[model samples]
Target: HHHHANKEATRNAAALFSVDYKAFLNEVDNLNKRMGDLRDINGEAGAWARIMSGTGSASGGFSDNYTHVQVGVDKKHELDGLDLFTGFTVTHTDSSASADVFSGKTKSVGAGLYASAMFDSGAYIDLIGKYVHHDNEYTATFAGLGTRDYSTHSWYAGAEAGYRYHVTEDAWIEPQAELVYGSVSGKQFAWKDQGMHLSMKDKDYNPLIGRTGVDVGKSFSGKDWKVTARAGLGYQFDLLANGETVLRDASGEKRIKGEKDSRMLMSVGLNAEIRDNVRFGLEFEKSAFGKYNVDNAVNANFRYSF
Candidate 1:
């Protein structure tokens, strides 16, 4: 009789366990669906703020200071497994330089538009175009040549291609290549002593740059807060002029013939989610071009997602 009772108790427990298992599976399915929905919404819209500074100095009193500020927006939509994105950026730059007997400053405003197509395998391609208008003012004081003031206007456009590979869940590696073509519009320089203005010639040049980098990022999530940190390193190759006679000095001597430069890029960033749809980020970047040239930037951004 006791054996029979034990058998009956086992059967009753098995029935209850089966019912609980089914309910547990249903809850897990619902949880997964919720996670997917969160990802979809978070990937749709974003905005960024950026700032950069570059400084270079040469032996013969040649030095340059460059500052750039930019704001950008990104929007993405998903169709099937493909993600399509469009980005818009507005930028402003202030560059000042002193080279030998010349001192100058340039101010520019620019805008850029780009479209990207991303696949499920973490591969992407981008088509980029930009336009800039530059206003330049310069004064040259040569020993016996007196002083002169000159001005010029310039424009630039470019395209880029890149690919990103997801090496792990929280790590990625990317390679990017770009080419930019630009032209400087001719201007008149006033020769104070001669009491006349001379027309300068228009110049054109192209720059090709390539970079390969790897990024590692991680996130920590808690009941009411989330934080993320990322770090990256890149190597860049720049081909300027590339056997072209695009740059000339005041005396019509070729200034920049063909030059190749390699640079090291490093960056680190941290972000904190202050609210459900808002976050704040701080980032620092350094680019070492050569012994005499380096670029450093610090950026702070407040991002809102929809």
Candidate 2:
């Protein structure tokens, strides 16, 4: 067969990276949501840590699992009438996705930085960027049975803005919209079965996502401690996507399709302040285009303000 079947296998394996990356992007967005506000501490600078994990189902019997650990520091300032917060984070992501014919693990060491400004009038805006470098390894089990290694790169840049309307002393609602541009660099690889060898070429990707949502929150406070609960619903839609991977060999390039990404998103979170300088939070996000594509992620975080 000269390993023509390897073409489809190669396409399927590449698709795994696309599906897994969304979870990482979500985590970074949540990180900004959880820590972007400096009002919690009001004490200048702080250090934070977090752990998050999730699972999602894909088409063609493929599923993915993702976990990430992050640590970072944040600082806030008040100049004239505006309050500004900025932070930088270093994170490590561990992820795996598998199908019958293709499977592998992709790990990344990424850095994300953000800035936010809150005005006395309850208007706020946040801007963020993330650069993720991936080390990819995969096993192809078909006419050609072996493993391949490659490097992939991705970056996300986005912004969110809204106005907070306080309903009562401890309750408020905010509606915001976000836009992110993402690009993953392409790769080239080859594998062989028996006497024939097959190679895949390079083509980069761009996925622009737009999200709009409203967040509702309520807070309970004591003399030295406080807790806040937040819930949000957003529509995550894609402006551009490439679900097909090209296969190359003796003849030409063939495009094979994989799973389509989900669009709707839901979120819930609980944040706490202890004795004025320590803060912690738990948050969750879920996405469903259908029962067919189900994805969920949850994270726990700690912060110390100084």
lDDT of 1 by residue, 1-306 (tens): 555744432332222111211111111101011111122234587675655555655434566667776676878787776677678877777777665566666677777776666666555555656666666565555422344344333344544455556566655555655444444443322232344332222234344555566655676777666676767677756555333322222333222233455667777876677556766666676667543344555555555666
Q: Residue by residue across 173-228, what tens digits does model 2's lDDT show?
A: 98888888887777776767667777666567766777888888999999999888
* lDDT of candidates 1 onward, in order: 0.50, 0.72
Which portions of model 1 miss their true places by more than 4 Å? Answer: 1-48, 143-202, 223-226, 240-258, 271-274, 279-281, 289-292
Model 1 poorest 10 in a row by lDDT: 27-36
Residue pair clashes in candidate 1: none
* Top candidate when judged by lDDT against the true structure: 2
Q: Quote the positional error of residue 20 for candidate 1 in Å.
A: 72
Each prediction's total of clashing residue pairs, residues at least 3 apart in sequence or on different chains, is 0, 0
Q: Quick one: RMSD of model 2?
A: 3.2
